[PDB]
């Protein structure tokens, strides 16, 4: 995690990432997809 | 230099900084010169 | 089959299970318990 001030590009600076998870799950990984929330309000139709 | 290594001197971690100690564990051992750095200095001084 | 408590141990129902701590070398989901000793410092000692 780092502080930043720009959306458009990745920073030209160096910081290593440290290990949170290390599980012996054994499942191979070919593909993936991101999870991101959608907003809805009175303005939106709210249809799923 | 000044080939004196206290066994307690390493004890744990620290062996890492001291490569010489690491070798000392190692089976490999540096043997001090017959003429110590001080003696060599005296000899070089004698010659000089 | 006849689950009854009256029956003798052979024929009687089975209070039994089996598990692999298992020998095959592989990554480990689980292993048998490790024992531990006191942390003996300052002395020359074998250690794990």
Resolution in A for the shown PDB structure?
A: 3.5
| B14 at interface of C, judged by CB pairs closer than 8 A | no
Experimental method: cryo-EM
Q: Find the closest chain B residue to C39 by CA distance.
A: B12
Which residues, 6+ apart, have CB-to-CB distance to C32 below 8 Å? Answer: C21
Q: Cα distance from C39 to chain B (closest Cα, Å)?
A: 11
- Closest-CA residue to B3 (of B20, B22, B16, B15): B20
B7: chain C residues, CB-CB within 8 Å: 44
Contact call for B8 and C42, based on CB within 8 A: yes
Q: Cα distance from C25 to chain A (closest Cα, Å)?
A: 14
Residues 16-45 of A with CB under 8 A from C: 24, 26
Length of chain A as a residue count: 48
DSSP state, residue B26: T
Q: Find the closest chain C residue to A25 by CA distance.
A: C29
Q: Locate tokens 């540096």: which residue?
A: B30
Tokens of residue B2, six digits: 């000044």
Which residues, 6+ apart, have CB-to-CB distance to B31 below 8 Å? Answer: B3
Distance between CA C48 and CA C41 in Å, rounded?
A: 13
Distance between CA A6 and CA A10 in Å, rounded?
A: 8
Tokens of residue C24, six digits: 């095959």
In degrees, rounded to 5, the angle at the alpha carbon of residue A23 between the alpha carbons of residues B13 and C28 is 80
Distance between CA C43 and CA B11 in Å, rounded?
A: 8
Helix (H) and strand (E) counts in chain C? 0, 0
Q: Find the closest chain C residue to B6 by CA distance.
A: C42
The secondary element (H helix, E strand) that includes residue B23 is: helix B19-25
Q: In this structure, are residues C29 and A27 in contact, taking their beta carbons and an 8 Å threshold?
A: no
């Amino acid at each position: 995690h780092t502080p930043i001030n720009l959306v458009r590009d990745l920073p030209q600076g160096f910081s290593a990432l440290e290990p949170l998870v290390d599980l012996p799950i054994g499942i191979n990984i070919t593909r993936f997809q991101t999870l991101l929330a959608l907003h809805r309000s009175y303005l939106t139709p709210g249809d799923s | 230099a000044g080939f004196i290594k206290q066994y307690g001197d390493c004890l744990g971690d620290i062996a890492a900084r001291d490569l010489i100690c690491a070798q000392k564990f190692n089976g490999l051992t540096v043997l001090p010169p017959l003429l110590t750095d001080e003696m060599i200095a005296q000899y070089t001084s004698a010659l000089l | 089959y006849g689950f009854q408590p009256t029956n003798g141990v052979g024929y009687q129902p089975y209070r039994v299970v089996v598990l692999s701590f298992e020998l095959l070398h592989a990554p480990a989901t689980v292993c048998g318990p490790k024992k531990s000793t006191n942390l003996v410092k300052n002395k020359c000692v074998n250690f794990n």
